[PDB]
Design an enzyme around this catalytic site. Structure first.
Site, short mmCIF file in Angstrom:
data_model
loop_
_atom_site.label_atom_id
_atom_site.label_comp_id
_atom_site.label_asym_id
_atom_site.label_seq_id
_atom_site.Cartn_x
_atom_site.Cartn_y
_atom_site.Cartn_z
N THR J 1 65.53 36.65 -5.26
CA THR J 1 64.29 37.23 -5.83
C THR J 1 64.20 36.98 -7.33
O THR J 1 65.21 36.78 -8.00
CB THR J 1 64.20 38.73 -5.58
OG1 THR J 1 64.46 39.00 -4.20
CG2 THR J 1 62.84 39.25 -5.94
N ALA J 49 62.17 44.60 1.34
CA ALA J 49 60.74 44.37 1.48
C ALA J 49 60.08 45.49 2.27
O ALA J 49 58.99 45.94 1.91
CB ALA J 49 60.50 43.02 2.16
#
Lengths: 200, 199, 212, 197, 220, 204, 212, 202, 198, 201
Positions: J1, J49
């Protein structure tokens, strides 16, 4: 334990406390923490006493052997190098040691710090033990290179007293040594109860 | 595993089962647990098979080497002592039970019960293995002095059958041996010959 | 397994201008039981030096044997008896020898100084020694050390005279202290042995305590 | 903590490090030196554990100086680097393994400059620039952004100052003064230490 | 730590020691163990020394209530049941070993209770660290249908053999006798050991301890 | 452990018609001083005092709750409380939290307002009081106190000798413990007057 | 780790000579597997030995000691081994094998009759050794020793019959209150006439408390 | 522990030992392991003593309360099922290993076993405890259909004795109880009354 | 770790703290503020875990403002400190324990100033000067050496700066910026930040 | 990320990457990490997520209910406080979260940072993920309140690309957003395989 040492114009000065504990029970309060290796060297005890005595005795013996063989007093650098290369063969066994080697050689005064891990380093102000953190503050704010002798004594004494006031594993009496170009001398040995009244 | 040995006037009798496990899966079911050491000296293996086979091979080697120099048949105490030393030195063997039976000219039928560890004992009858616990009382109620060969044989057979019906780590055929001066007599019991009880 | 044990057996020592004293209990224990009540922990090495040990018993015994075997070696190789400082300096090394499998004994040595005085040396199981005036190592250290420092060091006592010690006073003090330190500790009692070192030689006493 | 950086040019090399030592709460020193001079135009920058750095560096130094005083010439950096790597990987699988990282900036008369890299597992990569320590995270990117193969000298110095400012801005540890040196066809040169008030 | 209880011809005898240790340091040298459950029932208790006090107080309160409601002397079976159930309800987190005993309309009765809820109805029993030597003395020198002045000596010997031989128990010895017309509660019955005489003093002078401040408060 | 996280010590002694209770003075976290005027002795009515030692939190909490209960007691029925009832109250309060307890070891000392005779008690983590007639101690440096008191305490003593002996014992004791010391305070209770004193000790 | 073991052993010292007693059981956990094994040896004409613990190590020691006695008795120098020497040798052996973390699980009792005086010893697995007038190992340290001590306190000199009676008395409580025990034991005596071991015996029992 | 139960035509027979143990020390050597539940129904405890005592007391209470209503002598299956439920609802907290035996007017003598799990099986005879493993072969080679009373008595006695010699956690006195239609009869064996088997010697 | 320091005097109080918020390698913020205003003449300085600090402080501030709005007057520092200690000790033995360290400088018109000290176990000492964090080791001895009760206002700032430079010489962590505040009879005041270049 | 965000004269700028792994296996390379909470606010995904999506959809629900009840749009500080207080109940259970709340209110622009531990702080420059350290270094050399929109776009692109060139768990595409006083807009979804050519690569 609290042991400090610093060097200046007229040589090096060493100071230490005199307490020993076994957990929370005070075994003795009259210990000798400033070791007299030779009439030109000095040591220091912190951590394990048996170790900090045995290995320093061996060091003194080796220094004398060198002096006899080569007909020249050994140096501080080589002495600390020896002491460091001696205990490095016992890494990761349980040894605990923190030591200060002080002297005066052909190139001037000398102060080295050594430990069982392996870090050997020079300097000008050093302090180790459970109360070194409280003593650094007083030594720094008050230190100077162009100082007299009548003042460095009081500086070290006050540092040690203020370290014992707060730390619990350190107290008792205060020992102080001063090294010169010729040799070292024992200048005084005071008590904390006799200093508390000297101050407020 | 169920091993057993009994002693009568002239010689002795040995008996064992025919199973070998690897957990809950039977890797063998016709195994042979009566190992010869000499002409008239036999050992019974219990525990790990590797250690037992190794120690027995070494002991046979030693004995055969030390029975050709003296030019005299060996004894049973000698073999038992060799086993005892070899099992006390390496207490990591887990060879565990050996029961040792034989016939010597000086004494008669002899039985020794070297257990886990390196200790040795002589008894009139001995048993061993996991399935021995379930046949102690029976034996303690049935042994009597003055037995003959057939009596010892059938007593051993009955005890083994009783131990094999209750234990899961023992079963199959029942191997028997009778040792005396004249010679060795081996045999097996399977199926309807095995003594059966009611339920 | 555990290769150590705990047996108890406090020890006490005192030094004077021309005398020394070494006192011990007399009992042996293991857990909550009692093995025996006649097992002194004070031994005599030469005509002017005695030593006491406490802790694990087997180590004590073998260490005594070792010391006794080495004194004769020194006498043979140098043609002279060994002093007190020499024995202390030898014991430091003998102990440090086993730094990674140590003994479990708290030793104490008493005797006469070189000239005529009294000397005491307290040790640890690793080999760190220092000369002292009075020490009470052992199990009941915490009970006696806080007392010997008032009636013998005169701490926390103002307007008090020094009035140096003597022989009978020290003996009676030792007796009373050990008689008081038996009603609170359970590993100590059933007798008390005293060895006294003077200019003449080595003398022994014996006293009786309560049997639990 | 620790920080080493090396940059390579067309006809020079530039190395820098911090100078600080500490015991878990306090910095004992502020004039340290993590560099070692193996020869006239070779430099070893070692860092890592406490007592292994000096041991390894002095071993290497002794052996190299011995090679010189024995044969009659010096040792090329591409050779000293592989010597170091071999010795370290050998001592890694013994009772006394060393835990250190190092760079071996140098210069040669035939092949020109050089810069290498190690990761205490005896890897021996090679790059036109490299760095060590946690700080490497906040100063590697910068290089990749502003570095060019035909980078001159003062521009390399300015890039270095930039990376050090970034460190003193985002990094938690103090690290207030650094030691920097340069290597060229004539030898080693020491420059004014990069210090921030 | 050295409880003991025995039954004889016309009642019950019961004994214990008088020492308590907090670790390996004697904290007390005269502590009471023989507790009162009812005018004809007494319970001696080892254990954690609080779990056994609270339990006894509770059972005594409930027994007093039962007696006042019913209108006659309580029994031993009720106390046994109460203790059994209350201890089993806790799965053993209550260390309350006891040697409850007493007398009622029927003959004498002696029970032993364990922290889980197990009980026995033996004629002579022991408990605590030091129970083995006492039980040995019993097994050797016990007989049935004995009298008072024999059972007392028996119990005293059984306790002394556990005093001089265990590091966790030694002091004056207690005792208690319960018959249909007698409740002798002898404390102490005998003193085997005592402190030794002093061979000197310490000069407890007046005015030898420094002081920094002082305060006074008068009362009426 | 967790009891030795702060340190402390208290003691109590009996006299002819008087009684004495003493405590140390220090507050720190496991190696470090913070202040020197910590309180461990509290009044529970005229001629009755109680001292506590251990985790500071718990001594504070116990004192607050105990006063909360004692005030209501004295208010409902109008009369000062006697020591035995106080001991039992405290024992119940401690046993209530048998699981998740308070890490404290009280010590009670006072007189009887009917016949002015002494009384001293020493509870523990949960209970098991020890009603004695010589002395009691509580803290981390307990062996030193048991060794100093036993030698001293002749069976009968006057206020002056009592103060002297208890002071000497406490001083020569806390000078052998590292996590306790840095001052001492003493209280003496008689029929018609109370005495409070501090001592000259080593602040190291 | 220990597999087959033995329970406690007793020891008492009377006017002239010494006595020992011990059961016959090689238990394996909770199972009485062997029931006619002897746990006592005769070393010399003036020394004996009893052992408790693993049986294999006891056999090892028996072998070693027998060979040592045979080796010293061949020279014909007019010398002999005394019980105290045996005691010390055993102590050293156990300490040695413990210092290497390969001990011998066994507690031993020695007894003998030297020139005019008797002897009774003790050796543990770690090397803890001492002497005493009468002692016992295993669980018997709780059931047996009390009676012996209470009888020796009132009269610390006993006749042979008065010792055998007390022994037969104490070997009856262990059956009642020890689980790893059996009703068959041996009794041996050492005097000037030499050692003498008796056959298997039995202890009369009473269960009158079963009807109440 | 070692408990045994046998069934004959008009009743049943029980048998148990008299030892309790808390390690290698014997806390009692006379304990009674035969606990009546009704006038003509018994039980045999094993494992922990506390749990067995509690379970047996509760079952006795429930069964008395259930019988006082119906006005009829209870059955054995009823008590056995009560035990089953009580020991199955707490199989993670109990160690009981119980046996039930008795008489009732519908069916003759009845025996049931209830091990630690919470099962329930009826069988011609049953055994339990730690010392039972040592006799699993003796009851098999001696049982026979058509046994009278005295036969069952001496059979149980002999089996108990043989289990009490090799096991260290069992021994002492042998308690017996015979149940039938007319009434109950208890009995105790000790000393020279217990059987003896000659020990083997070479 | 963080750093809080507090000094008491004859007729005032002084407090100082750090301005840094970091996540394990990087200082994400350099303008932080760890001072919570509970009243006109009361402050709270909290240190420790991540979210417990703000939750606890907001709870206490809400309840103090509620007292003020309900009764008509404010709480004195002693009452606020004991309330804080009580609530913290109650939450210690619950399903939501808070791990925080606190200082509660304050002023009152009756008993004068006050500077308290509280650990994560709710001990509630009282001291003339005090400090938190690892930096309190290299700072307390200087105060013991130079502190005097009848100290002035500017000498306090001088001594504070004195004990701050010692941190930028031995302390491994940077800590370049600090916030400082003072309390007196008129209320809270805000002084220039004690910053050091770099 | 890898996510970054910074505010300046002409509003706030946000950026992220488009990669999603499960250990060493790249599961997705077209993820959308800039959550569009509403036409007024924005979000950011980092960590887990599922959580970063669920606990912000709930926040959207609550902000809409607020707007309905009170007839006034919500702020940024209140949003962050709501999220932090709703997430603090699950301390020590296994939640992983790191987010940035970006927007514009009567107090001007707004940028806040939140995580699951409980800390909530404002700022002017933030970066999150396993490659935020490589982005900080290049964003710090080039940041200035007095920037122009084009240069800020280029700076964000460059920072994300340089972070991607070093971090292994970061790469794919660069999606750039921009928030103004009357909402926000999407700008571009460039691909890294094409920037390597435009730039000096």
């Amino acid at each position: 334990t609290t042991t400090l040492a610093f060097k200046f114009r007229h040589g090096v000065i060493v100071a230490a406390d005199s307490r020993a504990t076994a957990g929370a029970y005070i075994a003795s309060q009259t210990v000798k923490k400033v070791i007299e290796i030779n009439p030109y060297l000095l040591g220091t005890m912190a951590g394990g006493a048996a170790d900090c005595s045995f290995w320093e005795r061996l060091l003194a013996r080796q220094c004398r052997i060198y002096e006899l063989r080569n007909k020249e007093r050994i140096s501080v650098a080589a002495a600390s190098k020896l002491l460091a290369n001696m205990v490095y063969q016992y890494k990761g066994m349980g040894l605990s040691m923190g030591t200060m080697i002080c002297g005066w050689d052909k190139r001037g005064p000398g102060l080295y710090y050594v430990d069982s891990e392996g870090n050997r380093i020079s300097g000008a102000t050093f302090s180790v033990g459970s109360g070194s953190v409280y003593a650094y503050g007083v030594m720094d704010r008050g230190y100077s290179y162009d100082l007299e002798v009548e003042q460095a004594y009081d500086l070290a004494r006050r540092a040690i007293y203020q370290a014992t006031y707060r730390d619990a594993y350190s107290g008792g009496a205060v020992n102080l040594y001063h090294v010169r170009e010729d040799g070292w001398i024992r200048v005084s040995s005071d008590n904390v109860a006799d200093l508390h009244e000297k101050y407020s | 595993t169920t091993i057993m040995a009994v002693q009568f006037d002239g010689g002795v009798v040995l008996g064992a089962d025919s199973r070998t496990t690897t957990g809950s899966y039977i890797a063998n079911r016709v195994t042979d647990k009566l190992t010869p050491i000499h002409d008239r000296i036999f050992c019974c293996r219990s525990g790990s098979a590797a250690d037992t086979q190794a120690v027995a091979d070494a002991v046979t080697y030693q004995l055969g080497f030390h029975s050709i120099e003296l030019n005299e048949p060996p004894l049973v105490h000698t073999a038992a002592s060799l086993f005892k030393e070899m099992c006390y030195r390496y207490r990591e063997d887990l060879m565990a039970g050996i029961i040792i039976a034989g016939w010597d000219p000086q004494e008669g039928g002899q039985v020794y019960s070297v257990p886990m560890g390196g200790m040795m004992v002589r008894q009139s009858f001995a048993i061993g293995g996991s399935g021995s616990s379930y046949i102690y009382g029976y034996v303690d109620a049935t042994y009597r002095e003055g037995m003959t060969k057939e009596e010892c044989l059938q007593f051993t057979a009955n005890a083994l059958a009783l131990a094999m019906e209750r234990d899961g780590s023992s079963g199959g055929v029942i191997r028997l041996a009778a040792i005396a001066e004249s010679g060795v007599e081996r045999q097996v019991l399977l199926g309807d010959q095995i003594p059966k009880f009611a339920v | 397994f555990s290769p150590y044990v705990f047996n108890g057996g406090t020890i006490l020592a005192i030094a004077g201008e021309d005398f020394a004293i070494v006192a011990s209990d007399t009992r042996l224990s293991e857990g909550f039981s009692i093995h025996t009540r006649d097992s002194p922990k004070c031994y005599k090495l030469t005509d002017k030096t005695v030593i006491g040990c406490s802790g694990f018993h087997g180590d004590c015994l073998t260490l005594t044997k070792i010391i006794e075997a080495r004194l004769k070696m020194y006498k043979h190789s140098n043609n002279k008896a060994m002093t007190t400082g020499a024995i202390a300096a030898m014991l430091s090394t003998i102990l440090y020898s086993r730094r990674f499998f140590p003994y479990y004994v708290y030793n104490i040595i008493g005797g006469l100084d070189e000239e005529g005085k009294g000397a005491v040396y307290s040790f640890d199981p690793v080999g760190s020694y220092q000369r002292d005036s009075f020490k009470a190592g052992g199990s009941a250290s915490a009970m006696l050390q806080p007392l010997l420092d008032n009636q013998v060091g005169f701490k926390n006592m103002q307007n008090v005279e020094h009035v140096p010690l003597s022989l009978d006073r020290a003996m009676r003090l030792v007796k009373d202290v050990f008689i008081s330190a038996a009603e609170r500790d359970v590993y100590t009692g059933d007798a008390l042995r005293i060895c006294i070192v003077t200019k003449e030689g080595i003398r022994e006493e014996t006293v009786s305590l309560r049997k639990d | 903590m620790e920080y080493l950086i090396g940059i390579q040019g067309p006809d020079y090399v530039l190395v820098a490090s911090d100078r600080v030592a500490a015991s878990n709460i306090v910095q004992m020193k502020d004039d340290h030196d993590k560099m070692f001079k193996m020869s006239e135009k070779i430099l070893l920058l070692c860092v890592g554990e406490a007592g292994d750095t000096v041991q390894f560096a002095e071993y290497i130094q002794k052996n190299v100086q011995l090679y010189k005083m024995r044969n009659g010439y010096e040792l090329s950096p591409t050779a000293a680097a592989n010597f170091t790597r071999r010795n370290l990987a050998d001592c890694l699988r013994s009772r006394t393994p060393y835990h250190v990282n190092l760079l071996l900036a140098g210069y040669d008369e035939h092949e020109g400059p050089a810069l290498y890299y190690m990761d205490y597992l005896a890897a021996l990569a090679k790059a036109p620039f490299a760095a060590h320590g946690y700080g490497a995270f906040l100063t590697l990117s910068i290089l990749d952004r502003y570095y060019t193969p035909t980078i001159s000298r003062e521009r390399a110095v300015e890039l270095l100052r930039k990376c050090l400012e970034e460190l003193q801005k985002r990094f938690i540890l103090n690290l207030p003064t650094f030691s920097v040196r340069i290597i060229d066809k004539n030898g080693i040169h020491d420059l004014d230490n990069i210090s921030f008030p | 730590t050295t409880i003991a209880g025995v039954v004889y011809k016309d009642g019950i005898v019961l004994g214990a020691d008088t020492r308590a240790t907090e670790g390996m340091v004697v904290a007390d040298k005269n502590c009471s163990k023989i507790h009162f459950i009812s005018p004809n029932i007494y319970c001696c208790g080892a254990g954690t020394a609080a779990d056994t006090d609270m339990t006894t107080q509770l059972i005594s309160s409930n027994l007093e209530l039962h007696s006042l409601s019913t209108g006659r002397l309580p029994r031993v079976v009720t106390a046994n049941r109460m203790l059994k159930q209350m201890l089993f309800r806790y799965r053993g987190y209550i260390g309350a070993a006891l040697v409850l005993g007493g007398v009622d309309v029927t003959g004498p009765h002696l029970y032993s209770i364990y922290p889980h809820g197990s009980t026995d109805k033996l004629p002579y029993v022991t408990m605590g660290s030091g129970s083995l030597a006492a039980m040995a003395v019993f097994e050797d020198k016990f007989r049935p249908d004995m009298e008072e002045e024999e059972a007392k000596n028996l119990v005293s010997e059984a306790i002394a053999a556990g005093i001089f031989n265990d590091l966790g128990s030694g002091s004056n010895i207690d005792l208690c006798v319960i018959s249909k017309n007698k409740l002798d509660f002898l404390r102490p019955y005998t003193v085997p050991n005592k402190k030794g005489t002093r061979l000197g003093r310490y000069r407890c002078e007046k005015g030898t301890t420094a002081v920094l401040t002082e305060k006074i408060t008068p009362l009426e | 452990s967790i009891m030795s996280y702060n340190g402390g010590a208290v003691m109590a002694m009996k006299g002819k018609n008087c009684v004495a209770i003493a405590a140390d003075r220090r507050f720190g976290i496991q190696a470090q001083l913070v202040t020197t005027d910590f309180q461990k002795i509290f009044p529970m009515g005229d001629r009755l005092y109680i001292g506590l030692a251990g985790l500071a939190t718990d001594v504070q909490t116990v004192a607050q709750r105990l006063k909360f209960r004692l005030n209501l007691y004295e208010l409902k029925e109008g009369r000062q409380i006697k020591p035995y009832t106080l001991m039992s109250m405290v024992a119940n309060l401690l046993y209530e939290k048998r699981f998740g307890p308070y890490y404290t070891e009280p010590v009670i000392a006072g007189l009887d307002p009917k016949t002015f005779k002494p009384f001293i008690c020493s509870l523990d983590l949960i209970g098991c009081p020890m009603v004695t007639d010589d002395f009691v101690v509580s803290g981390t440096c307990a062996e030193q106190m048991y060794g100093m008191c036993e030698s001293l305490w002749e069976p009968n003593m006057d206020p002056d000798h009592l103060f002297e002996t208890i002071s000497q014992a406490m001083l020569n004791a806390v000078d052998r413990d590292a996590v306790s010391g840095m001052g001492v305070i003493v209280h003496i209770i008689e029929k018609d007057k109370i005495t409070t004193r501090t001592l000259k000790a080593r602040m190291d | 780790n220990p597999m087959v073991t033995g329970t406690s052993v007793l020891g008492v010292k009377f006017e002239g000579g010494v006595v020992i007693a011990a059961d016959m059981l090689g238990s394996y956990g909770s199972l009485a597997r062997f029931r006619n094994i002897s746990r006592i040896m005769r070393v010399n004409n003036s020394t004996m030995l009893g052992a408790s613990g693993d049986y294999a190590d006891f056999q090892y020691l028996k072998q070693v000691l027998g060979q040592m006695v045979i080796d010293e008795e061949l020279l014909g120098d007019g010398h002999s081994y005394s019980p105290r020497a045996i005691h010390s040798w055993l102590t050293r052996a156990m300490y040695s094998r413990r210092s290497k973390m390969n001990p011998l699980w066994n507690t031993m009792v020695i007894g003998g009759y030297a020139d005019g005086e008797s002897f009774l010893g003790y050796v543990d697995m770690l090397g803890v050794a001492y002497e005493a007038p009468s002692l016992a190992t295993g669980y018997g340290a709780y059931l047996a020793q009390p009676l012996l001590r209470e009888v020796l306190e009132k009269q610390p000199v006993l006749s042979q019959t008065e010792a055998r009676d007390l022994v037969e008395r104490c070997m009856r409580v262990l059956y009642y209150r020890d689980a790893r025990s059996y009703n068959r034991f041996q009794t041996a005596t050492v005097t000037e006439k030499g050692v003498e071991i008796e056959g298997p015996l039995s202890t009369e029992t009473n269960w009158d408390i079963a009807h109440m």
